[PDB]
PDB file of C-alpha atoms and ligand atoms in Angstrom:
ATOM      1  CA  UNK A   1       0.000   0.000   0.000  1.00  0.00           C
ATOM      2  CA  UNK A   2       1.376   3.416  -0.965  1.00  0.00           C
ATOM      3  CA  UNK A   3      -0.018   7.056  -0.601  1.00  0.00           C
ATOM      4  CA  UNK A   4      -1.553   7.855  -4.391  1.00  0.00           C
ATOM      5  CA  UNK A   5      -5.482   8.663  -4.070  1.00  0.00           C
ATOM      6  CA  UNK A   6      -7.821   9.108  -6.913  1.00  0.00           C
ATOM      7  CA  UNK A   7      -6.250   7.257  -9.522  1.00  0.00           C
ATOM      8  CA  UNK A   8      -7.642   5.245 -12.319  1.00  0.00           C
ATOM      9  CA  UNK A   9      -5.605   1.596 -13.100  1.00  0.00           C
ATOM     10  CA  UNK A  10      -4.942   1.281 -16.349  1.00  0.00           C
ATOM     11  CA  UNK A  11      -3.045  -1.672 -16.229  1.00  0.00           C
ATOM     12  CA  UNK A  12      -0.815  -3.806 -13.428  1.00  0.00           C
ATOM     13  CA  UNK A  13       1.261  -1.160 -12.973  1.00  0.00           C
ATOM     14  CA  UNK A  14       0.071   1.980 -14.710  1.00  0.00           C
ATOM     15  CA  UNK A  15      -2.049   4.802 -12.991  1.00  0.00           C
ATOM     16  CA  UNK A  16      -3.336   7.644 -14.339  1.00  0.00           C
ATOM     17  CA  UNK A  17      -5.341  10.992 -13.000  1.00  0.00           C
ATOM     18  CA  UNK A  18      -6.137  14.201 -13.812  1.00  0.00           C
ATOM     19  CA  UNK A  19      -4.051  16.591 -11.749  1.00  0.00           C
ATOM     20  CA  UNK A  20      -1.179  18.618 -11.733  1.00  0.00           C
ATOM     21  CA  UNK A  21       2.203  16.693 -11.263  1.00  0.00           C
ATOM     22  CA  UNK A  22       3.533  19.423  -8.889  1.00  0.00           C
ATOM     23  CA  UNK A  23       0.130  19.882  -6.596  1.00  0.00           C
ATOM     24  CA  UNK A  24       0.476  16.155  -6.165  1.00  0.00           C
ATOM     25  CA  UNK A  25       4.139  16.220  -5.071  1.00  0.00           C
ATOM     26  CA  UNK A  26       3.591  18.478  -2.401  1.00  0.00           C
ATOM     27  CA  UNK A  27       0.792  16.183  -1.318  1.00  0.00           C
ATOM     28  CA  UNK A  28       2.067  12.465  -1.925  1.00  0.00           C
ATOM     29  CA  UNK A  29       6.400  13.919  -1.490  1.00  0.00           C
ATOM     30  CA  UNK A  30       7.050  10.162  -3.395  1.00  0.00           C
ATOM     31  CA  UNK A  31      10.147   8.635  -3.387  1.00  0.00           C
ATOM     32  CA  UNK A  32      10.364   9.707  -7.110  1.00  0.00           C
ATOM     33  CA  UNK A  33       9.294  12.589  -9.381  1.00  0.00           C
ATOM     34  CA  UNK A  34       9.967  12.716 -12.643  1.00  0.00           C
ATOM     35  CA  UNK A  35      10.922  15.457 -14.520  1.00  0.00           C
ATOM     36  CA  UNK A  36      10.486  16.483 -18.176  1.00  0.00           C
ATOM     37  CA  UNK A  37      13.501  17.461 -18.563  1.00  0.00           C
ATOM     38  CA  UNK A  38      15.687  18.799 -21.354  1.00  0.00           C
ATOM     39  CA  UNK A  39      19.681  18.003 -21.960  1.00  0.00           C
ATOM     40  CA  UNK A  40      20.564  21.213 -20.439  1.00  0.00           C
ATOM     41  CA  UNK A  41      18.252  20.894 -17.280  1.00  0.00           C
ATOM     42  CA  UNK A  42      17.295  24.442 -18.097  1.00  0.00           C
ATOM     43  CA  UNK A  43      13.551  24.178 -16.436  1.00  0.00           C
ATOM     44  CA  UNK A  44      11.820  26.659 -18.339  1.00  0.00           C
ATOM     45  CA  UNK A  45       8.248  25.951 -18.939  1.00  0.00           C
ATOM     46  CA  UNK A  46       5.964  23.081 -18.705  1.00  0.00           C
ATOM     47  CA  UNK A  47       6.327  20.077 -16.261  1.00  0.00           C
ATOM     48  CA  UNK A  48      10.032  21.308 -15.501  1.00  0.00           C
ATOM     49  CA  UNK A  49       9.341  25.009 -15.167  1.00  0.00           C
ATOM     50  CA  UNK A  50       6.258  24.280 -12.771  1.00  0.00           C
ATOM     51  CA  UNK A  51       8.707  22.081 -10.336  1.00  0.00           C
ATOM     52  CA  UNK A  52      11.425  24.397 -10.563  1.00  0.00           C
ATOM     53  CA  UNK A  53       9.386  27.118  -9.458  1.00  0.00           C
ATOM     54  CA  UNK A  54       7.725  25.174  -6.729  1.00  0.00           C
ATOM     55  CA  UNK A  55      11.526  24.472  -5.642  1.00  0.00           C
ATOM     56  CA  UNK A  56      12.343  28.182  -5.547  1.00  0.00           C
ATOM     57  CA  UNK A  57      14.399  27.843  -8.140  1.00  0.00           C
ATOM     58  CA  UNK A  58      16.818  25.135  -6.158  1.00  0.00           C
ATOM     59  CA  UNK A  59      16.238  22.432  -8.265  1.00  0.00           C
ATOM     60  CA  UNK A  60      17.820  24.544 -11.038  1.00  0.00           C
ATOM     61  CA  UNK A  61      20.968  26.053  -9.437  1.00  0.00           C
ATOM     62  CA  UNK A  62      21.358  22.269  -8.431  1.00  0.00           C
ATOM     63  CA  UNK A  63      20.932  21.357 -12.466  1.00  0.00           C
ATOM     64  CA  UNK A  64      23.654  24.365 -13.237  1.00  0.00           C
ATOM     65  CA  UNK A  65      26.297  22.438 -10.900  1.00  0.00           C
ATOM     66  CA  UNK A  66      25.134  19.274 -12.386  1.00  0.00           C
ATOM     67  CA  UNK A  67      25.812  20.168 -15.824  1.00  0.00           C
ATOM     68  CA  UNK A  68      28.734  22.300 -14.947  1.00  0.00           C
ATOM     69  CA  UNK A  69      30.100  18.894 -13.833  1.00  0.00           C
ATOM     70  CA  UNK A  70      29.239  16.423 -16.457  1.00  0.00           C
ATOM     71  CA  UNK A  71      28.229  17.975 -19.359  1.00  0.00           C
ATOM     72  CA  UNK A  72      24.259  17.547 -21.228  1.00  0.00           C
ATOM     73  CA  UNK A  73      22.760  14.789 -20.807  1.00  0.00           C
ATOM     74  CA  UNK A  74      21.180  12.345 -23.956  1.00  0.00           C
ATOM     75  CA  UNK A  75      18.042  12.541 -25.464  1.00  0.00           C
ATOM     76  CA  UNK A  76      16.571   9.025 -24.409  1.00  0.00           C
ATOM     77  CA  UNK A  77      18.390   9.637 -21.165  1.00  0.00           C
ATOM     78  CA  UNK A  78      18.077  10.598 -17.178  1.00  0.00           C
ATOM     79  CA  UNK A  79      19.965  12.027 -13.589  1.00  0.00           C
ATOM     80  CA  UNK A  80      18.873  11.501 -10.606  1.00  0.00           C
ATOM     81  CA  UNK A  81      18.865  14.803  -8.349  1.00  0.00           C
ATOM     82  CA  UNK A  82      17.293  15.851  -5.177  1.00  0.00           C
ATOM     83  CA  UNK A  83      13.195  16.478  -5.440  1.00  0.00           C
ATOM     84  CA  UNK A  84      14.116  19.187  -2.795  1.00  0.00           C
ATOM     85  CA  UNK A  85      10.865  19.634  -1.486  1.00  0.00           C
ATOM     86  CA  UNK A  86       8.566  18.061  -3.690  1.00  0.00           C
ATOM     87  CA  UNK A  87      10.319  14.327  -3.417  1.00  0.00           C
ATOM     88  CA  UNK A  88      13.022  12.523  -1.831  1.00  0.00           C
ATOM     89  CA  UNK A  89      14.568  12.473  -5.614  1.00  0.00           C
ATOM     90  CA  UNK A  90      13.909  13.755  -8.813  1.00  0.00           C
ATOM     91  CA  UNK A  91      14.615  11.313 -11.942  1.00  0.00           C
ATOM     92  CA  UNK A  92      15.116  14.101 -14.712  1.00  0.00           C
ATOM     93  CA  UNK A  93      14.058  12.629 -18.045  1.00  0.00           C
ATOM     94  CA  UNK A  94      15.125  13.448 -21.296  1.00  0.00           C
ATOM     95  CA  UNK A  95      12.323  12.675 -24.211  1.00  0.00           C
ATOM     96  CA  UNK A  96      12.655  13.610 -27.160  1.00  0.00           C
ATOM     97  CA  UNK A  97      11.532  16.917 -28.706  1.00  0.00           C
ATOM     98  CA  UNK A  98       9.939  16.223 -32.509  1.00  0.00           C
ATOM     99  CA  UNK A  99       9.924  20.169 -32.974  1.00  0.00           C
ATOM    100  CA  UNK A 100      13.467  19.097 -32.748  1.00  0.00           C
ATOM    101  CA  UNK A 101      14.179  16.611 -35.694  1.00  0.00           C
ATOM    102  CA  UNK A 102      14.568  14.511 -32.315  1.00  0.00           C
ATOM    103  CA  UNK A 103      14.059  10.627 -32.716  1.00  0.00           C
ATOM    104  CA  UNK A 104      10.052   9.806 -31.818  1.00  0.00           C
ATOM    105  CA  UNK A 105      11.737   6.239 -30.542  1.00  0.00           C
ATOM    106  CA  UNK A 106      14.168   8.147 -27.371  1.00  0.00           C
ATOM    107  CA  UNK A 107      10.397   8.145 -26.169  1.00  0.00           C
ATOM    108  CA  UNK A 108      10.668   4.745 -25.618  1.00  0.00           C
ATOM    109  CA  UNK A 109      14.507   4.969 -24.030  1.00  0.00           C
ATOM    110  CA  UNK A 110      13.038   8.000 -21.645  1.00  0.00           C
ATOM    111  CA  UNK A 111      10.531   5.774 -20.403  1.00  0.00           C
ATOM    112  CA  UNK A 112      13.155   2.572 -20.079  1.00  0.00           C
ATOM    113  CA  UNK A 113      14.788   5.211 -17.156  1.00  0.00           C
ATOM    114  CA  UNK A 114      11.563   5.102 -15.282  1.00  0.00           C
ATOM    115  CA  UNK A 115      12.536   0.832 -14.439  1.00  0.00           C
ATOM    116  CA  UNK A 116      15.575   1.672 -11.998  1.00  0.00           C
ATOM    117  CA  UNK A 117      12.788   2.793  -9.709  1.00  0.00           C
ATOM    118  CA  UNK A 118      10.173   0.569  -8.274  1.00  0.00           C
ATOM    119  CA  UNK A 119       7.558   3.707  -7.942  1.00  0.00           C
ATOM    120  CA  UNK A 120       7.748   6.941  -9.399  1.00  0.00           C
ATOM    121  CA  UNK A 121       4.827   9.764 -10.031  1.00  0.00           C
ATOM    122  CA  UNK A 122       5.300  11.216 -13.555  1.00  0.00           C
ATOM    123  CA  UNK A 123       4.038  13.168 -16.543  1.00  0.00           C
ATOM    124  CA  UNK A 124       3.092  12.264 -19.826  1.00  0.00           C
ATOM    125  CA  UNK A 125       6.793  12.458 -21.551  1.00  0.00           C
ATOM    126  CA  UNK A 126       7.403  14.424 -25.042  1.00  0.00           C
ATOM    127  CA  UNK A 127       3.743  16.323 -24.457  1.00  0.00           C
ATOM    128  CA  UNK A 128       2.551  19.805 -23.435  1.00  0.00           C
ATOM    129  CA  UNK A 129       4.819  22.432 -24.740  1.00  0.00           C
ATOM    130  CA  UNK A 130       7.330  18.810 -25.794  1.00  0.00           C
ATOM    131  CA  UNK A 131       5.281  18.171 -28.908  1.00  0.00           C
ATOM    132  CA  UNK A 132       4.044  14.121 -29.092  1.00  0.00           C
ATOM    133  CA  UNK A 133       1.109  13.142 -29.320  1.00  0.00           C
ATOM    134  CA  UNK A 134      -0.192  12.153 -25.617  1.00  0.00           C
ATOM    135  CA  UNK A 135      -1.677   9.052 -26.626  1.00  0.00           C
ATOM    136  CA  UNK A 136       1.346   7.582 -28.158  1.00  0.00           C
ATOM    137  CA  UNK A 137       3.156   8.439 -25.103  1.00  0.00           C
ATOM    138  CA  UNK A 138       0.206   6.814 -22.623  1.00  0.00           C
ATOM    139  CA  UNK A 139       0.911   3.619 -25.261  1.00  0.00           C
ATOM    140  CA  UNK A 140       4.723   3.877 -24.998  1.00  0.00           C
ATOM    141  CA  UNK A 141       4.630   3.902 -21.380  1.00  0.00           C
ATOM    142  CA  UNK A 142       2.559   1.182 -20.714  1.00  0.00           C
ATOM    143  CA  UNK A 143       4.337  -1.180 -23.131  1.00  0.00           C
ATOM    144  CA  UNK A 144       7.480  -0.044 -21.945  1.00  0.00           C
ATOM    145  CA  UNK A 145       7.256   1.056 -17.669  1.00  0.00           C
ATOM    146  CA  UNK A 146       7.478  -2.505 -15.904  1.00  0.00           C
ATOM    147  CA  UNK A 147       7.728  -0.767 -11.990  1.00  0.00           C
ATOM    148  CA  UNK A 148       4.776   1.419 -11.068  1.00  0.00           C
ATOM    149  CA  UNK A 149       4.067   4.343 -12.548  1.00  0.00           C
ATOM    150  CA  UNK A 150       1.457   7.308 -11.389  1.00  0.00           C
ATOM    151  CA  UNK A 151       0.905   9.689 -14.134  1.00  0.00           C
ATOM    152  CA  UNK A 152      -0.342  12.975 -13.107  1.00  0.00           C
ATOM    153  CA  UNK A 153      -1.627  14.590 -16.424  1.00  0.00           C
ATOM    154  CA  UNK A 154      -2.328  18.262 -15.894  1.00  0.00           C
ATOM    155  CA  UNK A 155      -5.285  18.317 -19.000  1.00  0.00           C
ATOM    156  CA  UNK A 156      -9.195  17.219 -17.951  1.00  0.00           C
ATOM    157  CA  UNK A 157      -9.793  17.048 -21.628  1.00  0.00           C
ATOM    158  CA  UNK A 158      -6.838  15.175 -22.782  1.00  0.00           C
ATOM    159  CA  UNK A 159      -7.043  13.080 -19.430  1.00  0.00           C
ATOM    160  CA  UNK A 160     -10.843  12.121 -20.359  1.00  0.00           C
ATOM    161  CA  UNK A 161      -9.385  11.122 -24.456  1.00  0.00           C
ATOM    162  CA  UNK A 162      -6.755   8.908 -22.799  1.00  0.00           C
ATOM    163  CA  UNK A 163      -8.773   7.033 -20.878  1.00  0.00           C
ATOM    164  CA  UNK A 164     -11.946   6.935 -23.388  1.00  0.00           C
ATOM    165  CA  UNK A 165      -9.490   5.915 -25.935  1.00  0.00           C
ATOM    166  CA  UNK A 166      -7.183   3.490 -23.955  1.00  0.00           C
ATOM    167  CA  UNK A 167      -6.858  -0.229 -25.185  1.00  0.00           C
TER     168      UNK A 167
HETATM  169  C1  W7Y B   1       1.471  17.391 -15.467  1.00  0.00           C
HETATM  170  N1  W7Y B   1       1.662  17.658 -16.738  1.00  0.00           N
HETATM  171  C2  W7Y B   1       1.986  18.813 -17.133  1.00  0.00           C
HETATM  172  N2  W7Y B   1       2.162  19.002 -18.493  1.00  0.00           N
HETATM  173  C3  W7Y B   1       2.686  20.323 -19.093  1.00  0.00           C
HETATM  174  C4  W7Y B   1       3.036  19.941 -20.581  1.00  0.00           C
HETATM  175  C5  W7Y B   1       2.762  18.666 -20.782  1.00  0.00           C
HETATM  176  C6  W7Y B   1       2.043  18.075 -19.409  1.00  0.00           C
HETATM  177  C7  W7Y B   1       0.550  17.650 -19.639  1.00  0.00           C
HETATM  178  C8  W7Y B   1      -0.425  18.632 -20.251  1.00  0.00           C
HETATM  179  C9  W7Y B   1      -1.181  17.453 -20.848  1.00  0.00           C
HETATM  180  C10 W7Y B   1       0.107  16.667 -20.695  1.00  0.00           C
HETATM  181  C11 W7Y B   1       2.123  19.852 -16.184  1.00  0.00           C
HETATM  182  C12 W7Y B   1       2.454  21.231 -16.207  1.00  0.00           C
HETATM  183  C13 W7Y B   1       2.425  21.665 -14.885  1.00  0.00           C
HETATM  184  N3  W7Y B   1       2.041  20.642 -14.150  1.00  0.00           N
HETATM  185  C14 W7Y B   1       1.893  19.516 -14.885  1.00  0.00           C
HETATM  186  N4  W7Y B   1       1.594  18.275 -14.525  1.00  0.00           N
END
């Protein structure tokens, strides 16, 4: 038994919800938030702009060291960082960007990072201000995320077409 409410199964270990991945960090602080991240961490907008701010601005002066250290990371790939207050950790995840020219199959590598962790809450990678098509990503994640996974998808109406639409 963990601490997620109000989520809908999709599958063994897939849960979805409509909600803001940020409001339900502060609530749930899981093990493990993930990120949509870019290869700079530079947390602009979106998923990554929304935690950053909720961090006051911590989690990216953390990314600038982290980067300052080891260089971008890969599309496709991941660091693990502190989830300062949102999160014991933060598992920054790199899909790809198709506004880009950026590989619609890293989508599938992003969401192989999500496996090193038995739990994590986490948005709908490569969507929003991303680009991909949300349903592809809801498929990609399911046939791809074997450890459980709540998705916190910050869109009633695209939350309601994922679900009515889910096979
Ligand atoms: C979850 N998803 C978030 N987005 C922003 C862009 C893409 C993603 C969803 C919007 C439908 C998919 C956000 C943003 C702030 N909080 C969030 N929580």
């Amino acid at each position: 038994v963990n601490s997620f409410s109000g989520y809908l199964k999709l599958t063994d270990n897939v849960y979805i919800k409509n909600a803001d991945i940020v409001e339900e960090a502060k609530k749930v602080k899981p093990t493990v938030v993930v990120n949509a991240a870019n290869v700079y961490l530079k947390h602009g907008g979106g998923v990554a702009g929304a935690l950053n701010k909720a961090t006051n601005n911590a989690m990216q002066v953390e990314s600038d060291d982290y980067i300052a250290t080891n260089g971008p990371l890969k599309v496709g790939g991941s660091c693990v960082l502190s989830g300062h207050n949102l999160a014991k950790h933060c598992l920054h995840v790199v899909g790809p960007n198709v506004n880009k020219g950026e590989d619609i199959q890293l989508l599938k590598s992003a969401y192989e990072n999500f496996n090193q962790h038995e739990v994590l809450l986490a948005p709908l990678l490569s969507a929003g201000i991303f680009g991909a098509d949300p349903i592809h990503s809801l498929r990609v994640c399911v046939d791809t995320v074997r450890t459980n996974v709540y998705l916190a998808v910050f869109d009633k109406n695209l939350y309601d077409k994922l679900v009515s639409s889910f096979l």
